[PDB]
């Protein structure tokens, strides 16, 4: 299975998940950096093990929603919409 995050801001920016920890946030150390000033420096983590993508909010200032519902941890699926700050990320999860 391959998993790509698609930033839905017009930029066409994407990030393919690595196995293990993927940090999304505004910080320089994030694997996928969003400059959105409402995004925490370490905002969320997605753990990928080749089968399951498990999102966790990292005690973020503004929270994380999946498909418009606030979440702490969430098992992601193809097409899920993650909202953080004013940004939206579409999950693209496709079996080979």
């Amino acid at each position: 299975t391959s998993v790509t995050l698609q930033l839905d801001d017009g930029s066409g920016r994407t990030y393919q998940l690595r196995e293990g920890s993927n940090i999304i946030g505004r910080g320089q150390d994030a694997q996928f950096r969003l400059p959105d000033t409402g995004v925490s420096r370490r905002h969320l983590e997605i753990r990928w093990d080749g089968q399951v993508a498990l999102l966790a909010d990292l005690n973020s200032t503004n929270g994380t929603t999946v498909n418009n519902a606030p979440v702490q941890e969430w098992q992601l699926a193809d097409g899920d919409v993650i909202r953080l700050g004013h940004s939206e990320i579409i999950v693209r999860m496709h079996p080979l």
Binding site: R26, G27, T37, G38, V39, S40, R41, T61, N62, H86
Partner: peptide
């Protein structure tokens, strides 16, 4: 990489 703005 300022403090996050609260929404």
């Amino acid at each position: 990489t300022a403090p996050t703005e609260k929404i």
